[PDB]
């Protein structure tokens, strides 16, 4: 696999979003990976609905948190609507998938990256954007402005984001805190430290969609 990956340069990443106060990171994270694999497989970059996952993933807890895995499983079982059809409201409401017509996109399954394994995660990122989790509660992460982030941070993961690239010393992360945070909404997190957890627990739980 190459020394640099950046799915933005391939036209596979939509603009940075702001989840707001709602605990919907898990849905934002999943949607990044759907937007990416549909571009890779079909050639078209579309925005898909975080709100649909927020409302409709019965295994998750709406704005009280959730699971990227079960959100990705939902898209493989049923599908997902365009963001324009089902825009983001920042609050969980009733599932409205059936009222909004046929699904826009569908995937075929979900896979987990082998946890606590840096190379396995890089391999997956070389193939497509990946849903990953990290510990975002620390002030250092909250206040991040730029550069390759080394912490300080623990491994008590609490925030789902998306890995959309990497380089020799970092993994490139699309966050859902708006374009004013970090590097126009992104953070480069240090890699190669030899800690099996990853910096900020980044290797704890990573999933990606499968699309034939
Ligand atoms: C993430 C965010 O919006 O910043 C959000 O808090 C979240 O989904 N957290 C997850 C954990 C990360 C993905 C590692 C979470 O807590 N998931 C479990 C379900 C939510 C907690 N339980 C209940 N009953 N609400």
Swiss-Prot record:
The keyword Zinc-finger does not apply. Optimum temperature is 50 degrees Celsius. Unstable upon 65 degrees Celsius. Keywords: Allergen, Disulfide bond, Hydrolase, Protease, Signal, Thiol protease, Zymogen. E64 binds at residue 25. One of its GO terms (biological process) is proteolysis. Leupeptin binds at residue 25. The active site is at residues 25, 159, 175. It comes from the Eukaryota. Disulfide bonds join 22-63, 56-95, 153-200. Repressed by the active-site-directed cysteine protease inhibitor E64 (L-trans-epoxysuccinyl-leucylamide-(4-guanido)-butane) produced by Aspergillus japonicus. Inhibited by the inhibitor of cysteine proteases from Trypanosoma brucei (TbICP, rhodesain) and Colocasia esculenta cv. Kaohsiung no. 1 (CeCPI, tarocystatin). Repressed by leupeptin, a peptidic cysteine, serine and threonine protease inhibitor. Changing residue 174 to R: Unstable. Slightly enhanced thermostability and higher optimum temperature. Enhanced thermostability and higher optimum temperature. Its EC number is 3.4.22.2. Optimum pH is 4. It catalyses: Hydrolysis of proteins with broad specificity for peptide bonds, but preference for an amino acid bearing a large hydrophobic side chain at the P2 position. Does not accept Val in P1'. Belongs to the peptidase C1 family. Cysteine proteinase with a high level of diversity in substrate specificity, an amino acid bearing a large hydrophobic side chain at the P2 position is preferred. This is Papain. The chain holds residues 134 to 345 of 345 of the full protein.
């Amino acid at each position: 696999i190459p020394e640099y990956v950046d799915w933005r340069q391939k036209g596979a990443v939509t603009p940075v979003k702001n989840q707001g106060s709602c605990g919907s990171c898990w849905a934002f994270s999943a949607v990044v990976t759907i937007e990416g694999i549909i571009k890779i497989r079909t050639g078209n970059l579309n925005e898909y609905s975080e709100q649909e996952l927020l409302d409709c993933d019965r295994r998750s807890y709406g704005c009280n948190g959730g699971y990227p895995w079960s959100a990705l499983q939902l898209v493989a079982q049923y599908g997902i609507h365009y963001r324009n059809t089902y825009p983001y409201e920042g609050v969980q409401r009733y599932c409205r998938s059936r009222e909004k017509g046929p699904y826009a996109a569908k995937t075929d399954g979900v896979r987990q990256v082998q946890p606590y394994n840096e190379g396995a995660l890089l391999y997956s990122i070389a193939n497509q954007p990946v849903s990953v989790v990290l510990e975002a509660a620390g002030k250092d992460f909250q206040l991040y402005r730029g550069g390759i982030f080394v912490g300080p941070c623990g491994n008590k993961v609490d925030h789902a984001v998306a890995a959309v690239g990497y380089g020799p010393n970092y993994i490139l992360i699309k966050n859902s805190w708006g374009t004013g945070w970090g590097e126009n909404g992104y953070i480069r997190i240090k890699r190669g430290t030899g800690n099996s957890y990853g910096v900020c627990g980044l290797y704890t739980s990573s999933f990606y969609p499968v699309k034939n």
